[PDB]
Amino acid sequence: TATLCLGHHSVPNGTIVKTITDDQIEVTNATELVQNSSTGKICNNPHKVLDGRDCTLIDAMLGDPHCDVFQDEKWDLFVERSSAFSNCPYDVPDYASLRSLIASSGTLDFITESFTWAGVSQNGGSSACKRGPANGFFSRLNWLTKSGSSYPLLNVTMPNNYNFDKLYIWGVHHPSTNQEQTNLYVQASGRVTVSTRRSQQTIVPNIGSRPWVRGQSSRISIYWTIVKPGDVLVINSNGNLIAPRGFFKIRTGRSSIMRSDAPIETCISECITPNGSIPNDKPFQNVNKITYGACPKYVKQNTLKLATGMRNVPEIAGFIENGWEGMIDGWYGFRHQNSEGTGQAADLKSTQAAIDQINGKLNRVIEKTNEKFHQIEKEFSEVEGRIQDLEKYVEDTKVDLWSYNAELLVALENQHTIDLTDSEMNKLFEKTRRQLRENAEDMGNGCFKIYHKCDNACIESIRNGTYDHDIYRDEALNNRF
Amino acid sequence: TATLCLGHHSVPNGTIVKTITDDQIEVTNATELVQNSSTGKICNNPHKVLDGRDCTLIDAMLGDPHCDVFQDEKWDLFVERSSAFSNCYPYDVPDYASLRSLIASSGTLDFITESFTWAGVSQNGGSSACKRGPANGFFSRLNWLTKSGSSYPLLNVTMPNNYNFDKLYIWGVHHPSTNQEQTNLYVQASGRVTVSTRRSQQTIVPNIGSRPWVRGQSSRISIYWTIVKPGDVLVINSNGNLIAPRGFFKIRTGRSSIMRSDAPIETCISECITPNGSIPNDKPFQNVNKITYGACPKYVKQNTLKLATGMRNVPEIAGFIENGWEGMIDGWYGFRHQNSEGTGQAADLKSTQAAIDQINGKLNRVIEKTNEKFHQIEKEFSEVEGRIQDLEKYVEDTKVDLWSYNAELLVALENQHTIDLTDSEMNKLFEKTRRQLRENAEDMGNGCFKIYHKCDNACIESIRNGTYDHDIYRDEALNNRF
Amino acid sequence: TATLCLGHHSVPNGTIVKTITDDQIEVTNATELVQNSSTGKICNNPHKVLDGRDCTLIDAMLGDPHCDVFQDEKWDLFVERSSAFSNCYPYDVPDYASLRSLIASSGTLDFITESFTWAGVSQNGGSSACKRGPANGFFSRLNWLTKSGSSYPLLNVTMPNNYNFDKLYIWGVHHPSTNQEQTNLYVQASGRVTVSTRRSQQTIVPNIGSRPWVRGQSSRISIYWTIVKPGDVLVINSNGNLIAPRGFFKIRTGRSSIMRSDAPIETCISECITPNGSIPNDKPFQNVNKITYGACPKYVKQNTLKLATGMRNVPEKAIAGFIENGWEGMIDGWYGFRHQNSEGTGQAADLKSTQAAIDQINGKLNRVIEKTNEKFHQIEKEFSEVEGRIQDLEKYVEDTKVDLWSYNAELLVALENQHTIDLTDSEMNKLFEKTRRQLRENAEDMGNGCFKIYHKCDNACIESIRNGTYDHDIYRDEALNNRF
Ligand SMILES: *[C@@H]1O[C@H](CO)[C@@H](O[C@@H]2O[C@H](CO)[C@@H](O[C@@H]3O[C@H](CO[C@H]4O[C@H](CO)[C@@H](O)[C@H](O)[C@@H]4O)[C@@H](O)[C@H](O[C@H]4O[C@H](CO)[C@@H](O)[C@H](O)[C@@H]4O)[C@@H]3O)[C@H](O)[C@H]2NC(C)=O)[C@H](O)[C@H]1NC(C)=O
Ligand SMILES: *[C@@H]1O[C@H](CO)[C@@H](O[C@@H]2O[C@H](CO)[C@@H](O[C@@H]3O[C@H](CO[C@H]4O[C@H](CO)[C@@H](O)[C@H](O)[C@@H]4O)[C@@H](O)[C@H](O[C@H]4O[C@H](CO)[C@@H](O)[C@H](O)[C@@H]4O)[C@@H]3O)[C@H](O)[C@H]2NC(C)=O)[C@H](O)[C@H]1NC(C)=O
Ligand SMILES: *[C@@H]1O[C@H](CO)[C@@H](O[C@@H]2O[C@H](CO)[C@@H](O[C@@H]3O[C@H](CO[C@H]4O[C@H](CO)[C@@H](O)[C@H](O)[C@@H]4O)[C@@H](O)[C@H](O[C@H]4O[C@H](CO)[C@@H](O)[C@H](O)[C@@H]4O)[C@@H]3O)[C@H](O)[C@H]2NC(C)=O)[C@H](O)[C@H]1NC(C)=O
Ligand SMILES: CC(=O)N[C@H]1[C@H]([C@H](O)[C@H](O)CO)O[C@@](O[C@@H]2[C@@H](O)[C@H](O)O[C@H](CO)[C@@H]2O)(C(=O)O)C[C@@H]1O
Ligand SMILES: CC(=O)N[C@H]1[C@H]([C@H](O)[C@H](O)CO)O[C@@](O[C@@H]2[C@@H](O)[C@H](O)O[C@H](CO)[C@@H]2O)(C(=O)O)C[C@@H]1O
Ligand SMILES: CC(=O)N[C@H]1[C@H]([C@H](O)[C@H](O)CO)O[C@@](O[C@@H]2[C@@H](O)[C@H](O)O[C@H](CO)[C@@H]2O)(C(=O)O)C[C@@H]1O
Ligand SMILES: *[C@@H]1O[C@H](CO)[C@@H](O[C@@H]2O[C@H](CO)[C@@H](O)[C@H](O)[C@H]2NC(C)=O)[C@H](O)[C@H]1NC(C)=O
Ligand SMILES: *[C@@H]1O[C@H](CO)[C@@H](O[C@@H]2O[C@H](CO)[C@@H](O)[C@H](O)[C@H]2NC(C)=O)[C@H](O)[C@H]1NC(C)=O
Ligand SMILES: *[C@@H]1O[C@H](CO)[C@@H](O[C@@H]2O[C@H](CO)[C@@H](O)[C@H](O)[C@H]2NC(C)=O)[C@H](O)[C@H]1NC(C)=O
Ligand SMILES: *[C@@H]1O[C@H](CO)[C@@H](O)[C@H](O)[C@H]1NC(C)=O
Ligand SMILES: *[C@@H]1O[C@H](CO)[C@@H](O)[C@H](O)[C@H]1NC(C)=O
Ligand SMILES: *[C@@H]1O[C@H](CO)[C@@H](O)[C@H](O)[C@H]1NC(C)=O
């Protein structure tokens, strides 16, 4: 007689995963699906990262004297440090919109235009904004005051004869007293009107004392205007006008701005976070919900294990609640007890089928990467109300939905992996049973008892699939009965 | 002796779908789940579609002379063309999008005239920039009041809401270009308009200054609106620069909206409208446009998604073990028998019907029929604004990504389950057939049986029907086997 | 000879569930996953609920005379009733919703009085529209400054922030109805109010004009607010039309919110609060309201979702097995054996298969979906007036969220039902296959889920088969002789 047993491998150390029907199940192999660490540095490749050391984007746009190294710059990502400061006092109504559009433009290209201001004096300065040892001002703005003892009505025009949009930055000066207002501007109540063929803005200055900032009790408000090709710009002013010196060329692209204190190093990475660059070889990440580039999706979980092997079962006997830790050639194989001696082999068909069905399984459902460049703000330092609440709500909803998606996907994939491995083992056992028609009996433990003399060539023929039952039919029948 | 095999059908040409464990598997039949084309026309049934032609909704509401055919109009969807223009006095609307959305969602342009009394001022002002034929004109729903004689008295009027519906009032403020013009039109050197109710107020101070010429005018007019709830009162107080209203608009709650499109409108029936045109809604997903009106499929980024309908296509007596039957056209599963009389073939109705019933209506168990949406947010912009536009784009992008993921995962899961159920059906039929033949037959290794007793056509039909009796032939089969 | 059968239990009354491959399938047990009812009452534990009664949050903050009981109050949820009204000077708040949300999220009404000096003006002005008992009054947290004698000097005051917490200041501007009233109350013919810090500024010019009478007044007051960070300074500059502040509000960070409801408040314990009332959170989904506070189930559009708990239900039709036949007489377990012998029929139960099925079924839904989500302050979801862009965006966001979560719930229920049915069927088949494996050549299956054994198999034999210590070599010769 002879014995033939079928089984599967085992490893000394398994990994616990979670499926649809099991809280904890041990498998031979698993992989991590969530990235939860960073090196703390920002790669300067392949994206173009511009470090604004002590300057904000608005300050560099306006022309702060200590921000003059940023003139005519361009970037893919602008990094704003927490140690930035202003050294020139002003306020911007709707600051966030201007900051966002300047960041999304991706450039600081400024073209000077020849404005004519007749009857007034130009190039005013203050001691609060020093350009060297002398008084200065913003380099992209012009402070106009009275000439002699008169301040006439200003009325200038400039058409857009190009084929791209223009961006104009202008301002209004708010004095602190009526005496100062009349001293700088002869009229007791100024007025600034800037309009195009389709839009208009009129600002009336406000007079009143304010806290001293670098020695000044007055302020300046900043406004902007966009002129389409074929349109025209008209500026009408009675006083308190901070005239523009030109226009900014505005483009459309994939630029943005980020707040971070991580240093920038010479390295390559496609994903940038405020914590630093992270690899994008995993479908999910847990570092930061603020990202730039090709980045994994953000989830609330810190670990998600995906099974890449069959069950780990501790240990002649077959595969019925028994693993073979002595198998290193393949996933499934045969063991036989013969007159010549015991032997072991491996089956390549089932092993390769399982490997093919396992490899690349996650790519069939979830896409590889998503490239997002400019998005909404997700951290705030001041309380505002309605819009901030809406933004926070949207971000929270997105995060919760994606976390649920990740959890369900991982559970389903683990369940299907376990099912396919079990099906492969059972199919191999059933094929082996079907090949031996009447010459063998099932021993009850995944093994077969062959009732005729089956030598090594016989076992090899059984394993190959070229076994003939008619050769040993009568001998097996005589032995069985 | 005899032979009884089991098998399944196959087709000369199959389709490749994707499952959970397979990236490409061939099946006998599949259907497309994504709609990706349109005819370029807009159906005027069953929704009421109003063509704006050369007019916008705001211009038609104000009373533009070339938009006078749109007075007292009704619509379910308003279509705005890119060739629309303005031909009246230049104006601007602060928060234009909010008023446009309000008027579009109201769904009607019904106007009721009221008896306003303006004592001491001139009425019915006009300009050469807004012509009613050969003579000067103005917006038909607004009244331009200027000085009478040499005085402009203080205007203070009231109007109560004694109905049971909301009232919408449209008024304006005139911004002159020079101080001399301001003094000439209105005696006072600084005008002021105050419009208020018992719960809200608005005060506007005009701005004097030159502006680019538009149809010969360097002055502008700003447009404002006020809503008066039932039982409330409206008070208008002014001393210059008032563009008075002539009445109120009825404002309703409904399912109306507005769209920007250039597709023509033709006689046809469709429940879904896109800027590209009308599309059928028989499929659960679409790829034409993310701007939709009516009962429409969900927008996904995928161009195609195939759902499996049949079984695995296996190319071609032998059984079902890696062998499909090309010559079978009468069913999905059946029998082939080899006998002394000759060969034959049949089909199994029960297993085929079970598989068909399981397959039929498979996708309706999860996805709702249709999502009918009428008024939504704007999804395309022609000018950069900032915060709110970014928020809207972010919301739309998140929605699109989530629904694309849902569609992909669902299609993969359904294909996997269809393949599994069909394989289980075939294996169950074979197992039952083996179960009937207790000891008179044994499996030959290729999904087919070898019978050791003389089993004729009546015998084969008895086996197929499920009424086979092994006791009659047991002794002969046992003698043949041993 | 002896007969051995395998089968499963069934119940007289079943319940219908929905799976991936079946529209309507009957099982032995199921549970409801959607909470669609409420008691109509709000529990005051464990959250601190503050009833607004006839006052709103803004009215309580300003100092309305009939809202004077809400001074220095704290809350976790503020409940605003539909019967609230105002009984003081008419006013309007530009961007009212932002201030309401700010005060609701702050969670307290703590007020600290500060010593402002207003030189050359008369303080503590009142009106007949706001009565403190028999006499004329005003808001308790605001100061109405008017001319003293025949002059109104320019006011310029400062107040530094020397603490380590943010300050909130509430002030206002008065809008007269006539120029004569403007001149009588304030000497200057045009007022101006400037309030600023080192990083912000606000200037308001009053409006003049008649308005509808509210409690005898055709004038209004506009409300503005300012926040001062630690180390900053506040400056107020004005020459008329100023409603001065009396101090600052302590502003905090926390998990407080506000809700509009008309449900009464009783003594009970509940972790979730809805405008309909409190609901239990023992289910993953609910259908009551999309406005919630606390640990609440997710909101879905469906009103019922049944999760299968048992196996398929098959009516019971010489003993028979599990092939299209249930056992209504089995109450000892899920799977078992039935044997007919010469001594008589017998029945038993199998514990391992039943225990495995129960352990797989138990706790199945906790593996994918989280228990509860704690949300405290969110966006508004109901509006009493039409506004335009922002309201449309909020409605769109809420509708998208609801649709996505409803789809998730439906798909999850269907998948779980399918897997439960599959696991029960697999367990029964595995038990039958093991029973076949034990009897190698001594019996053959009859096809109805039963084995009939050729040798003599008594109670010891049947018990050995059930346990698993059955030996086939003992009866092999007798079985072979009987079969052939
Ligand atoms: C309306 O009300 C506001 C606020 O109440 C007033 O604003 C104040 O204006 C005064 C000037 O009139 C400001 O005083 C100035 O402060 C400067 C900064 O002081 C800070 O820094 C120094 C050094 O670091 C510290 O010692 C000090 O404590 C502060 O922390 C000083 O540098 C100025 O000095 C100048 O004047 C002195 C006078 O002796 C000279 O000796 C000096 O050489 C120098 O010339 C000056 O003292 C004050 O800071 C303002 N306060 C605020 C909050 O802004 C308005 O003046 C008031 N308007 C009217 C019309 O009344
Ligand atoms: C403040 O600054 C602004 C802009 O700098 C000034 O606005 C300009 O005002 C002048 C008039 O004062 C405008 O000139 C007018 O332009 C009309 C349109 O011009 C277009 O069309 C004509 C004909 O097709 C073309 O030839 C031309 O190139 C343009 O393409 C003309 O139709 C007007 O014609 C009138 O004047 C002529 C003079 O010869 C007469 O013969 C005509 O019959 C007719 O009466 C006129 O020329 C100019 O367009 C305005 N510019 C802008 C940008 O709007 C303000 O006037 C100024 N304010 C002060 C107080 O100085
Ligand atoms: C600009 O235009 C507006 C609106 O047209 C005017 O506002 C009106 O001003 C008048 C003048 O005061 C107001 O009249 C007063 O109304 C009070 C309330 O009346 C309501 O309530 C009573 C009782 O509940 C009802 O019977 C009545 O129908 C109203 O529903 C009255 O109580 C006042 O009575 C006083 O005067 C009478 C005079 O005989 C005395 O007998 C009384 O004892 C008492 O002293 C008074 O009649 C009117 O309410 C205002 N309407 C609105 C809508 O605001 C502005 O006045 C106007 N401005 C200018 C400069 O012209
Ligand atoms: C363009 C201009 O007028 N520049 C002035 C500037 C302004 O007058 C002021 O900042 C606007 O509010 O002020 C400068 O400072 C002045 C002192 O030099 C002078 O002694 O006193 C003035 C006040 O009475 C004023 O502070 C400055 O800021 O440097 C002078 C500069 O030319
Ligand atoms: C209601 C009214 O006053 N209408 C005027 C109109 C206005 O005066 C003006 O548009 C407001 O800015 O202007 C009209 O045009 C005028 C010419 O006819 C006149 O020769 O010159 C005027 C300038 O000095 C003015 O342009 C118009 O727009 O048709 C006349 C109309 O009655
Ligand atoms: C702080 C103050 O001035 N308070 C006045 C108040 C105001 O004058 C008014 O409400 C602001 O618009 O008005 C009071 O009412 C007055 C009557 O008592 C008086 O007979 O007539 C006045 C009109 O000419 C005015 O209505 C009030 O509202 O009680 C008096 C209060 O001291
Ligand atoms: C990445 O940086 C963020 C900073 O935004 C870290 O999140 C903060 O972590 C600290 C310390 O636990 C908390 O006190 C803050 O509340 C967190 N902020 C937010 C917005 O969550 C985060 O821990 C960092 N992650 C890694 C891996 O370095
Ligand atoms: C329906 O119309 C839209 C117009 O928005 C088409 O989308 C544009 O397609 C062109 C050509 O590929 C692109 O260059 C644009 O970028 C697309 N615009 C947007 C906003 O996506 C769309 O292709 C049309 N679809 C059909 C089926 O005609
Ligand atoms: C909980 O209260 C809400 C209040 O909005 C109820 O929803 C309204 O129910 C009425 C009556 O059927 C409808 O006419 C409204 O259209 C509903 N409003 C909304 C926004 O859906 C809700 O039915 C209540 N729930 C329970 C269980 O009583
Ligand atoms: C486990 O799987 C990973 C990839 O999924 C593979 O690289 C690794 O070799 C596997 N483990 C073993 C022991 O082969
Ligand atoms: C393929 O399936 C569709 C159902 O989507 C059916 O209408 C069609 O008849 C099927 N094809 C064949 C050849 O049966
Ligand atoms: C059905 O299941 C519930 C819990 O899921 C349990 O409380 C109940 O007893 C079960 N019903 C029966 C008849 O076992």
Q: Using CA of residue C255, residue C258, residue C262, residue C265, what is the dihedral sign?
A: positive
Task: Answer whether B394 sits within 8 Å of A405, measured CB to CB.
Answer: no
Distance CA B458, CA C93 (A): 94
Question: Which residue shows structure tokens 């409300």?
Answer: C223
Show which subunits contact B, needing at least 3 CB pairs below 8 angstroms: A, C
Cα distance from N-terminal residue to C-terminal residue, chain A: 14
**Edge-to-edge strand list for the sheet holding C201-204:** C155-160, C233-238, C193-196, C201-204
Burial of C34 (0-12, 13-18, 19+ CB in 10 A): buried
Distance CA C372, CA C409 (A): 15
Which of helix, strand or coil describes residue A146?
A: strand
Q: Using CA of residue C321, residue C326, residue C329, residue C331, what is the dihedral sign?
A: positive
Dihedral of CA atoms B94, B97, B99, B102 in degrees, nearest 10, equals -160
Instruction: Choose among B289, B281, B258, B262: nearest CA to B49.
Output: B258
What are the distances in angstroms from CA B171 to CA A240, B130, B225? 31, 18, 6
Nearest by CB to B212, which of A232, A438, A477? A232
A406 touches chain B (CB under 8 A): no
Please state the length of chain B. Answer: 482
Instruction: Choose among A211, A212, A209, A191: nearest CA to A200.
Output: A191
Task: Report residue C484 as tokens.
Answer: 């052939």
CB-based contact A226:A166 (threshold 8 Å) = yes
Who contacts A133 (Cβ-Cβ below 8 Å, separation ≥6)?
Answer: none
Counting one residue from chain B and one from chain C, the pairs whose CB atoms sit within 8 A come to 108
Dihedral of CA atoms B290, A99, A211, C63 in degrees, nearest 10, equals 10
Instruction: Choose among B77, B146, B1, B3: nearest CA to B433.
Output: B3
Which of left, alpha, beta for C216 (phi over 0: left; psi -120 to 50: alpha)?
A: left
Distance CA A468, CA A472 (A): 8
CB-based contact B26:B16 (threshold 8 Å) = yes
Distance CA B227, CA B243 (A): 17
Residues in C touching A389 (Cβ below 8 Å): 101, 377-379
Q: Using CA of residue A270, residue A271, residue A275, residue A281, what is the dihedral sign?
A: negative
Question: Which residue shows structure tokens 């109050």?
Answer: C73
Residues in B touching A361 (Cβ below 8 Å): 20-21
C387 touches chain B (CB under 8 A): yes
- DSSP lists the bridge partners of residue C286 as C35, C299
Q: What is the DSSP string of A161-211?
A: -SSS-EEEEEEEEE-SSHHHHHHHSSSSS-EEEEE-SS-EEEE--------
DSSP code at position C20: S
Distance CA A126, CA A213 (A): 12
Distance CA C299, CA C381 (A): 13
Burial of A426 (0-12, 13-18, 19+ CB in 10 A): exposed
Backbone angles phi, psi at C337, to 5 degrees: -120, 150
Question: Which residue shows structure tokens 């009162």?
Answer: B233
Q: What is the DSSP string of B120-160?
A: TEE----EEEEEETTEEE--TTEEE-EEBTTB-PPEEEEEE
Distance CA A26, CA A312 (A): 6
Distance CA C432, CA C6 (A): 7
Task: Report residue C126 as tokens.
Answer: 């009142």
Method: cryo-EM
Distance CA A406, CA A412 (A): 10
Instruction: Choose among A13, A27, A17: nearest CA to A421.
Output: A27
Largest CA distance in chain A: 132
Q: Is A359 in the pocket of ligand 10 (CB under 6 A)?
A: no
Distance CA C14, CA A130 (A): 87
In terms of DSSP bridges, do strands C201-204 and B257-260 run parallel, antiparallel, or are they unpaired? unpaired
Question: Which residue shows structure tokens 């706790």?
Answer: C363
Distance CA B97, CA C424 (A): 59
Distance CA B283, CA B33 (A): 5
Distance CA A369, CA A296 (A): 6
For chain B, the 3-state helix, strand and coil shares in percent, each to the nearest 5, are 25, 30, 45
Backbone angles phi, psi at B229, to 5 degrees: -75, 155
Distance CA A397, CA C343 (A): 68
Instruction: Choose among A424, A19, A368, A413: nearest CA to B20.
Output: A413
Backbone angles phi, psi at B357, to 5 degrees: -65, -40
Q: Which-ligand-closest: CA of C194?
A: 1
Q: What is the DSSP string of B256-312?
A: -EEEE----EEEEE-SEEETTEE---SSSEE-S-S--EEEEPEE-S-S--EEE-S-B
Dihedral of CA atoms A259, A265, A268, A273 in degrees, nearest 10, equals -20
Who contacts A317 (Cβ-Cβ below 8 Å, separation ≥6)?
Answer: A5, A7, A445, A446, A447
What are the distances in angstroms from CA B298 to CA B118, B379, C53? 55, 15, 45
DSSP code at position A147: B
Task: Report residue A387 as tokens.
Answer: 């819009």
Which of helix, strand or coil describes residue B429?
A: helix
Distance CA C424, CA A269 (A): 50
What are the distances in angstroms from CA C37 to CA B293, C288, C294, C376? 34, 6, 17, 22
B388 touches chain A (CB under 8 A): yes
Distance CA A416, CA A270 (A): 33
Instruction: Choose among B45, B37, B5, B26: nearest CA to B334.
Output: B5
Distance CA A450, CA B318 (A): 27
Q: From atom 8 of ligand 5, which residue's Cα is the shortest distance away?
A: B185
Distance CA C351, CA C334 (A): 8
Distance CA C49, CA A408 (A): 37
Distance CA B420, CA A404 (A): 26
Tell me if the bond preceding B46 is cis, omega within 30° of 0: yes
Distance CA B333, CA B346 (A): 9
Who contacts C336 (Cβ-Cβ below 8 Å, separation ≥6)?
Answer: C6, C7, C8, C9, C327, C330, C347, C348, C349, C350
Distance CA B1, CA B473 (A): 12
Angle between helices B387-436 and A386-435 in degrees, nearest 10: 20
Tell me how many degrees the CA angle A414-A415-A418 measures, rounded to the nearest 5: 85
CB-based contact C218:C129 (threshold 8 Å) = no
Who contacts C203 (Cβ-Cβ below 8 Å, separation ≥6)?
Answer: A174, A206, A208, C192, C193, C194
Distance CA C176, CA C221 (A): 9
Distance CA C4, CA C457 (A): 10
List domains and CATH numbers for chain B. Answer: 2-36+282-481 (3.90.20.10), 48-259 (3.90.209.20)
- DSSP lists the bridge partners of residue C135 as C132
CB-based contact B306:B406 (threshold 8 Å) = no
Distance CA A315, CA A329 (A): 18
Task: Report residue B132 as tokens.
Answer: 């009613």
Distance CA C178, CA C189 (A): 11
Optimal mutation site among C106, C285, C437, C444, interface A, most CBs of chain A within 10 A: C437
Show which subunits contact C, needing at least 3 CB pairs below 8 angstroms: A, B
Who contacts B147 (Cβ-Cβ below 8 Å, separation ≥6)?
Answer: B121, B122, B185, B186, B187
Please state the length of chain C. Answer: 484
Q: What is the DSSP string of C119-165?
A: TTEE----EEEEEETTEEE--TTEEE-EEBTTB-PPEEEEEE--SSS
HSE at residue B431, side-chain half, CA atoms within 13 A, is 12
Backbone angles phi, psi at C152, to 5 degrees: -130, 95
In terms of DSSP bridges, do strands B285-286 and B298-299 run parallel, antiparallel, or are they unpaired? parallel
Distance CA B352, CA B332 (A): 5
Ligand 1 environment, Cβ below 6 A? A 209, 211-212; C 156, 158, 233, 235
Resolution (A): 2.8
Distance CA A439, CA A458 (A): 12
Distance CA C376, CA C255 (A): 6
Instruction: Choose among A456, A443, A460, A455: nearest CA to A319.
Output: A443
Please report the beta strands in A301-424, taking only residues with DSSP state E, as ranges in sequence order.
305-307, 332-337, 343-344, 370-372
Backbone angles phi, psi at B421, to 5 degrees: -65, -40
Instruction: Choose among A481, A474, A383, A395: nearest CA to A441.
Output: A481
Residue type, C109: L
Who contacts B480 (Cβ-Cβ below 8 Å, separation ≥6)?
Answer: B1, B452, B453
Q: Which-ligand-closest: CA of A211?
A: 1
CB-based contact C396:B375 (threshold 8 Å) = no
- DSSP lists the bridge partners of residue C127 as C130, C137
Tell me how many degrees the CA angle B210-B212-B215 measures, rounded to the nearest 5: 115
Task: Report residue B25 as tokens.
Answer: 């598997």
User: Which atom of ligand 1 lies nearest, measured to the CA of C237?
Assistant: 1
Task: Report residue B57 as tokens.
Answer: 């909704």
Question: Which residue shows structure tokens 């030996």?
Answer: C471
Q: What is the DSSP string of B169-203?
A: EEEEEEE-SSHHHHHHHSSSSS--EEEE-SS-EEE
For chain A, the 3-state helix, strand and coil shares in percent, each to the nearest 5, are 25, 30, 45
Task: Report residue C255 as tokens.
Answer: 């998990």
- DSSP lists the bridge partners of residue C26 as C16
Q: Which-ligand-closest: CA of B356?
A: 11
Distance CA A113, CA C268 (A): 73
Task: Report residue A259 as tokens.
Answer: 């707040």
In terms of DSSP bridges, do strands C247-250 and C111-113 run parallel, antiparallel, or are they unpaired? antiparallel
Distance CA C287, CA C276 (A): 11
CB-based contact C136:C126 (threshold 8 Å) = yes
Question: Which residue shows structure tokens 């013969």?
Answer: A338
C-beta neighbour count of A118 within 10 angstroms: 9
Please report the beta strands in B297-447, taking only residues with DSSP state E, as ranges in sequence order.
298-299, 306-308, 333-338, 344-345, 371-373, 441-443
CB-based contact C6:C452 (threshold 8 Å) = no
Optimal mutation site among C19, C23, C306, C448, interface B, most CBs of chain B within 10 A: C23
Question: Which residue shows structure tokens 């409803």?
Answer: C406
B170 touches chain A (CB under 8 A): no
**Edge-to-edge strand list for the sheet holding C49-51:** C49-51, C77-80, C257-260
User: Which atom of ligand 1 lies nearest, measured to the CA of A211?
Assistant: 54
B residues 218-247 closer than 8 Å to C (CB): 227, 233, 235, 237-238
Distance CA C50, CA C45 (A): 11
Tell me how many degrees the CA angle B106-B107-B112 measures, rounded to the nearest 5: 80
Distance CA A278, CA A286 (A): 10
C-beta neighbour count of C64 within 10 angstroms: 23
Q: What is the DSSP string of A41-110?
A: -EEEESS-EEEESS--HHHHHHT-GGGGGGTT-B-SEEEE-TT-------B-TTHHHHHHHHHHH-B--E
Instruction: Choose among A57, A123, A51: nearest CA to A92.
Output: A57
Q: Using CA of residue A35, residue A41, residue A47, residue A53, what is the dihedral sign?
A: positive
Distance CA B325, CA B336 (A): 10
Question: Which residue shows structure tokens 């161009």?
Answer: B303
- DSSP lists the bridge partners of residue B6 as B335
Burial of C82 (0-12, 13-18, 19+ CB in 10 A): exposed
